[PDB]
Scaffold this active site. Sequence first.
Site, short mmCIF file in Angstrom:
data_model
loop_
_atom_site.label_atom_id
_atom_site.label_comp_id
_atom_site.label_asym_id
_atom_site.label_seq_id
_atom_site.Cartn_x
_atom_site.Cartn_y
_atom_site.Cartn_z
N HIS A 64 0.79 -1.25 0.00
CA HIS A 64 0.00 0.00 0.00
C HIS A 64 0.80 1.26 0.00
O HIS A 64 0.27 2.29 -0.44
CB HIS A 64 -0.94 0.03 1.17
N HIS A 89 6.19 6.64 6.03
CA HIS A 89 5.78 6.15 4.67
C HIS A 89 5.27 7.38 3.92
O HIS A 89 5.14 8.48 4.46
CB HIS A 89 4.71 5.04 4.83
N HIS A 91 2.57 8.96 0.51
CA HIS A 91 1.42 8.88 -0.39
C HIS A 91 1.67 9.75 -1.56
O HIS A 91 2.28 10.84 -1.43
CB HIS A 91 0.17 9.40 0.34
N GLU A 102 -2.52 13.64 0.76
CA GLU A 102 -3.79 13.26 1.42
C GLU A 102 -4.48 14.53 1.92
O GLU A 102 -5.60 14.81 1.57
CB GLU A 102 -3.51 12.28 2.53
N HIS A 115 4.28 10.75 6.05
CA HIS A 115 3.76 10.55 7.39
C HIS A 115 4.78 9.87 8.24
O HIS A 115 5.27 8.79 7.87
CB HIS A 115 2.49 9.67 7.31
N1 LIG Z 1 -1.54 6.96 6.73
S1 LIG Z 1 -1.47 7.11 8.28
O1 LIG Z 1 -2.74 7.54 8.81
O2 LIG Z 1 -0.32 7.88 8.65
C1 LIG Z 1 -1.19 5.51 8.94
C2 LIG Z 1 -0.93 4.41 8.11
C3 LIG Z 1 -0.58 3.19 8.62
C4 LIG Z 1 -0.29 2.07 7.71
O3 LIG Z 1 0.81 1.45 7.76
N2 LIG Z 1 -1.19 1.77 6.80
C5 LIG Z 1 -1.08 0.58 5.93
C6 LIG Z 1 -1.03 1.07 4.57
O4 LIG Z 1 0.22 1.59 4.41
C7 LIG Z 1 -0.51 2.99 10.03
N3 LIG Z 1 -0.22 1.72 10.49
C8 LIG Z 1 -0.14 1.41 11.90
C9 LIG Z 1 -0.37 -0.12 12.09
C10 LIG Z 1 -0.21 -0.47 13.54
C11 LIG Z 1 1.13 -0.07 14.08
C12 LIG Z 1 1.33 1.46 13.89
C13 LIG Z 1 1.24 1.78 12.42
C14 LIG Z 1 -0.74 4.06 10.88
C15 LIG Z 1 -1.02 5.30 10.32
CL1 LIG Z 1 -1.32 6.57 11.48
ZN LIG Z 2 -0.07 7.76 5.72
#
Ligand SMILES: NS(=O)(=O)c1cc(C(=O)NCCO)c(NC2CCCCC2)cc1Cl
Ligand SMILES: [Zn+2]
Lengths: 261, 261
Positions: A64, A89, A91, A102, A115
């Site tokens: 993703h 990561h 976007h 975003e 992010h």
């Molecule tokens: N985009 S975002 O709102 O910044 C966000 C994205 C992911 C994430 O990894 N999404 C999967 C697709 O890439 C995430 N994942 C969590 C999973 C549990 C451990 C912490 C990270 C936490 C956040 Cl805040």
């Molecule tokens: Zn993100």
Amino acid sequence: KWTYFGPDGENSWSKKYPSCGGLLQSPIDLHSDILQYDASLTPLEFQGYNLSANKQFLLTNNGHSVKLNLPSDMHIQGLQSRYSATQLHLHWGNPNDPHGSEHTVSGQHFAAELHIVHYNSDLYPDASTASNKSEGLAVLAVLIEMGSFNPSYDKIFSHLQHVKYKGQEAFVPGFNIEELLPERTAEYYRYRGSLTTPPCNPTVLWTVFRNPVQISQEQLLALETALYCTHMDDPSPREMINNFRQVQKFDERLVYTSFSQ
Amino acid sequence: KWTYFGPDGENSWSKKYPSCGGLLQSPIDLHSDILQYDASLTPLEFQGYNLSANKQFLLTNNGHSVKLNLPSDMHIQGLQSRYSATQLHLHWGNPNDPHGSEHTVSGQHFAAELHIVHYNSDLYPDASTASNKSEGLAVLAVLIEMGSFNPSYDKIFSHLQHVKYKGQEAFVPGFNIEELLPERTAEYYRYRGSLTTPPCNPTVLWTVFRNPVQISQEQLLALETALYCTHMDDPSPREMINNFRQVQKFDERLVYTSFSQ
Ligand SMILES: NS(=O)(=O)c1cc(C(=O)NCCO)c(NC2CCCCC2)cc1Cl
Ligand SMILES: [Zn+2]
Ligand SMILES: NS(=O)(=O)c1cc(C(=O)NCCO)c(NC2CCCCC2)cc1Cl
Ligand SMILES: [Zn+2]
């Protein structure tokens, strides 16, 4: 399963991930009617962001985005708990439309968005546990615009041909993560929101920096053409492009700013 | 059933209304990189819009918008088939964020938006039957901004008092619906899309006029504060506000324009 395009795209996430249909969703459009200055939004301090160049950090294509694992000694100081880093990561859009942030500002997208995800390490023993608790997570968001070549972002981008498919991993030497942040980090937007991806947990304290950073057209194009959401051996490959969520209704929230004007 | 907020809001429509997660969804952002002049887009002709002052037309609050029934002798001429009117209705924001159009232009909302819904009467017997069928519907969209008092919109707005709660019905004497259209109706955006409400069928030919109309600050506030989406004797009343869908992703597509300048 979930995607950003087609039958399993974002209007369908809530079929499997109920919080994606719930309250406090991110991202949002940052525009004047919903902004309010808050003089209690004092500067953050970024501790342990200068990661040693003699150490390595794991870069992964998770189907993703591309994500870099971060060590938990890296943290933000200035919030009401210590929030320790877990991953960063991005976007982005696509080669013919490089408009994939975003968050939007007064209705305009930026080229891309970074992010840096942190979790409340005072209360939880890992980010996965924190992710489903109130204010369990704190994300720093950097808006990215097409501009000058950015050598610091290239410390990530120069490894992308190496993590093209879902599940692949690569090592990135340490570098100073603070070099990914813009100027005047004291100026930011703050609001309560959610993960922007499934499971869309409403557990994030967002900080979006006011000022963008720049990366070049060539760096954007490398980002937008290197990666696939699918495994290396998948007979129906899918390019990882346009991996941003549309903005969400505000549900009566306000966004607080550390700048007046 | 469906709402514009809470857990039955737009991210959940696709649970009961599968086309809301499918192709050709509306509304969209009309921005410069996706516009293409098309000299084939000639002016529409509005026939039978001057409704008899001796006839009355049914105004309803359906819990989603305020809608005026229109007669099937009213029609658009200039499309492949004749499209005959069936109803008009509006979408708006709220007084704290008075930017509730559904389409945006270069990322910007207008205050409100009027839709005049038509159905393909050459191919189908009535609007209900057309709505889920190929070439079934055509909508004229007028963008609305605050400015001058507008006596023609007041021919609808003066009846909002009588349709305050869901289910309530009033009668509006005929008037010339063409008065609701902006200047230079020759200038418009055109694309194939969908209903912006459930069931979100991908069966609408959209015509969004380039130029907005004005209504006064008092008229816009009356539209935003006159109606409730609940029945009169609901003990938990809810004001009808923010009844617009967020913009949808629109990639690898163009919006055609009748104007190049
Ligand atoms: N985009 S975002 O709102 O910044 C966000 C994205 C992911 C994430 O990894 N999404 C999967 C697709 O890439 C995430 N994942 C969590 C999973 C549990 C451990 C912490 C990270 C936490 C956040 Cl805040
Ligand atoms: Zn993100
Ligand atoms: N917004 S819009 O895309 O212009 C649109 C809306 C509605 C509608 O009435 N929605 C109910 C909530 O107000 C509609 N209704 C259909 C129902 C079946 C008969 C034809 C009109 C057709 C259209 Cl194109
Ligand atoms: Zn409508």
